[PDB]
Structures are given as structure tokens and as C-alpha cells.
């Protein structure tokens, strides 16, 4: 998947897909990656 956004403390999209139950979570919250 891809984790589109900017200045990775605020906003940012997150496309985790292939859960093997076929789910396309495109949750858009505030995250902290790595």
C-alpha cells in the first residue's frame, strides 16, 4: 500500500489493502509512522 501525505505528524492518508479478507481500509487519521 501507499501512505500519501505531508510532514508526517499531521493528517496523512493510508491505503492498507489485501487483508486476505479483501479489505481496502483507506482510513485518514493523524498518524505517526515508522
Amino acid at each position: 500500500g501507499w501512505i500519501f501525505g505531508t510532514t508526517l505528524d499531521s493528517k496523512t492518508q493510508s491505503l492498507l489493502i489485501v487483508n486476505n479478507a479483501t479489505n481496502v481500509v483507506i482510513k485518514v487519521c493523524e498518524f505517526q509512522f515508522c
Binding site: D9, S10, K11, E30
Partner: protein, 49 residues
């Protein structure tokens, strides 16, 4: 209880929301999270009477 934004580095896209409250830098002096003479808080409250 109602706020609005005054200072931002650029304009907005059509239908864009902004949540992050970072201290504005109006000059060459860095703010580093401290609202000094050239650093202002970006959210000012409405006054309703």
C-alpha cells in the same frame, strides 16, 4: 468556543481542512515552539456578545 485561522504560509485548496496548530513564523527569526515577538498563535477566538 469558536476559533478561526489568521496566519498561514500559503492559501488553501478548494475543500481543504486544516487541523495542525503550529506557531507562525512571520520573519527570519525561528520560533521553535515559542511564541515570541515575531511568532503568533494561529488560532484566535471569536468574541460573541
Amino acid at each position: 468556543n469558536y476559533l478561526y485561522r489568521l496566519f498561514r504560509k500559503s492559501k488553501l485548496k478548494p475543500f481543504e481542512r486544516d487541523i495542525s496548530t503550529e506557531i507562525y513564523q512571520a520573519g527570519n527569526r525561528p520560533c521553535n515552539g515559542v511564541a515570541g515577538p515575531n511568532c503568533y498563535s494561529p488560532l484566535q477566538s471569536y468574541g460573541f456578545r
